[PDB]
């Protein structure tokens, strides 16, 4: 019936593969990775499969080159002559990761998410940040140091954005698990978000019997 009459990703037509639960079309060449012919029965798009994001993103902080997927392997041709190399097998290039801060979530949740999510999920704040940075070369910029600075730091973010300057109430689980609303140093109040009793802050502990002692 309705589907792209040309690739999503190329935009020519021609012969297209189509989605079964989207109106989306590709060529079979222009997919991560590549397929060798168009396959039988159900088929979803990299869309339809796209997972999901964990929240609301509030801002793209940085951005590389993830590594491509694993190759499509090529059937060897029925008629194949046993000294005949198997057919090279059809290679992925490589996709934009992005690193996220997550509304309501503090600068310990960072976390990774593909240029397939922000399209899909963000694609407003995606297209503005597009416009802002130069999309072609990613920019740059004691063992818990180490963690610390590999985890966190080298992808933009100041140590003293993930240190406590207060703790401003808290709250128990269903569960009983408690949990302390953090005012994080260099960050306006309307930057401190909950954060569980478990969580590994540098002197947690001293900044929860600081907030009892508020209590008396
Ligand atoms: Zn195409
Ligand atoms: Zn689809």
Known sequence: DHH???????????????????????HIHCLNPPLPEIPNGEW???????????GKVQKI???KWGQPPSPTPV?????????????????????????????????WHCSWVSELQLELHCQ???????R?????????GDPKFAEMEE???????KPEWMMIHRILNHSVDKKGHVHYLIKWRDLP??????????????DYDLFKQSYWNHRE
């Open 132 to 140: 802002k940075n130069d999309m072609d070369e990613p920019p740059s």
């Open 61 to 63: 902080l940085i951005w």
């Open 189 to 202: 109040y309307d930057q401190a978000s909950w954060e569980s009793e478990d969580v590994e802050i540098q």
């Open 44 to 54: 979803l798009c990299p869309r339809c499969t796209c997972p999901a994001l964990k």
């Open 75 to 107: 059937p060897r041709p029925p008629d194949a002559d046993p000294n005949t190399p198997s057919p090279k097998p059809l290679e992925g290039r490589p996709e934009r990761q992005f690193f996220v801060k997550w509304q309501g979530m503090s600068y």
């Open 151 to 157: 985890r966190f730091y080298r992808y933009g973010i």
């Open 4 to 26: 792209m009459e040309f690739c999503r990703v190329c935009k020519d037509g021609g012969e297209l593969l189509c989605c079964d639960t989207c109106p989306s079309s590709y």
């Open 124 to 130: 407003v704040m995606f297209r503005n940040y597009q």
